[PDB]
Amino acid sequence: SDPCPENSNICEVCNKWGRLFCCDTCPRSFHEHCHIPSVEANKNPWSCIFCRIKTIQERSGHQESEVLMRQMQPEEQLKCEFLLLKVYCDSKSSFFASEPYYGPQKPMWLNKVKTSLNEQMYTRVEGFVQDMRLIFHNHKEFYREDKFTRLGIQVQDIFEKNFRNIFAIQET
Amino acid sequence: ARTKQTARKS
Ligand SMILES: [Zn+2]
Ligand SMILES: [Zn+2]
């Protein structure tokens, strides 16, 4: 019988079936590795990244310099993890997930930022934002085809908008 | 954390 009848039958990120982990405060479901951070399979009750972000947000304009200067404390760590997950939640991001096909000065892809952020290889937010922006830099450097160029432009705008919304950065 | 098993034809 369905262990979690009030929870999704497909992942929130890739929108696919399989072995799903179910949140205990909202009806979302995530693959073991599609969630960020990777699901702590033995934590009860387990809350997903959207509920933890809600908890932080309602109980916590800024300048981009100051945001980037922040050390990766658990709040900032969880915000960056959520921003990268929001990037994963778009289909176009699948183009930048695996290690690419060509040679740039420093290649970078989504899964490697997932790995480094998982192992807490970033001491400040600027490291994560800098690897994410380095993906788009290298894409604008090596690919000229119109379809994939537009694709990387769109994914870039998605990352930057989610970046300024989550860390509450000021316009103007 | 609770788990379940879903499938496209299920
Ligand atoms: Zn949840
Ligand atoms: Zn998934």
Side-chain angles (χ1 to χ4, degrees):
Chain A
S1 192
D2 192 342
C4 317
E6 287 68 53
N7 281 89
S8 184
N9 291 337
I10 53 180
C11 184
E12 272 284 298
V13 176
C14 58
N15 288 314
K16 292 183 174 180
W17 298 265
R19 179 176 179 254
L20 268 45
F21 276 86
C22 302
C23 179
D24 288 302
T25 63
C26 87
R28 297 181 167 91
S29 290
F30 308 85
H31 287 85
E32 170 171 6
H33 290 337
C34 279
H35 187 265
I36 313 168
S38 280
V39 186
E40 313 198 334
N42 295 275
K43 189 154 178 295
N44 302 258
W46 177 74
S47 296
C48 75
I49 182 64
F50 291 86
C51 301
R52 284 160 77 176
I53 284 295
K54 206 184 175 132
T55 305
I56 287 179
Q57 218 152 49
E58 286 172 338
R59 231 338 231 150
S60 83
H62 297 170
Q63 176 166 5
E64 198 192 303
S65 308
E66 177 268 308
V67 168
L68 289 180
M69 227 60 85
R70 293 186 200 172
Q71 185 152 32
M72 279 290 201
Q73 294 307 313
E75 288 221 344
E76 278 70 20
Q77 179 71 12
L78 206 68
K79 298 213 217 182
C80 295
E81 294 162 329
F82 180 67
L83 162 57
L84 175 61
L85 182 143
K86 287 298 293 184
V87 175
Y88 273 100
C89 284
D90 199 279
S91 69
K92 313 172 208 71
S93 62
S94 65
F95 184 83
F96 311 92
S98 305
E99 182 173 4
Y101 307 80
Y102 33 52
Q105 174 180 40
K106 183 181 167 194
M108 181 63 58
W109 49 96
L110 277 176
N111 295 328
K112 177 178 186 293
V113 179
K114 180 188 266 171
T115 305
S116 299
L117 185 53
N118 168 88
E119 296 164 11
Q120 302 179 23
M121 304 297 299
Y122 303 104
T123 64
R124 283 168 206 274
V125 186
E126 68 141 352
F128 162 76
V129 177
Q130 214 150 37
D131 280 10
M132 295 295 298
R133 284 167 171 164
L134 174 61
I135 297 174
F136 317 128
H137 292 334
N138 299 326
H139 191 64
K140 293 167 177 171
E141 189 182 359
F142 271 72
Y143 268 63
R144 286 159 70 260
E145 196 265 353
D146 310 327
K147 197 167 111 200
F148 293 169
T149 291
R150 294 194 306 265
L151 203 63
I153 296 177
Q154 294 160 27
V155 183
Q156 174 180 46
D157 270 71
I158 291 318
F159 165 76
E160 287 301 315
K161 286 162 174 174
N162 287 269
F163 165 59
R164 284 161 174 78
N165 285 315
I166 294 169
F167 285 97
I169 304 182
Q170 185 101 125
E171 268 187 11
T172 66
Chain B
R2 301 175 292 148
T3 36
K4 75 202 273 177
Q5 236 299 335
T6 63
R8 178 180 165 176
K9 294 174 65 47
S10 176

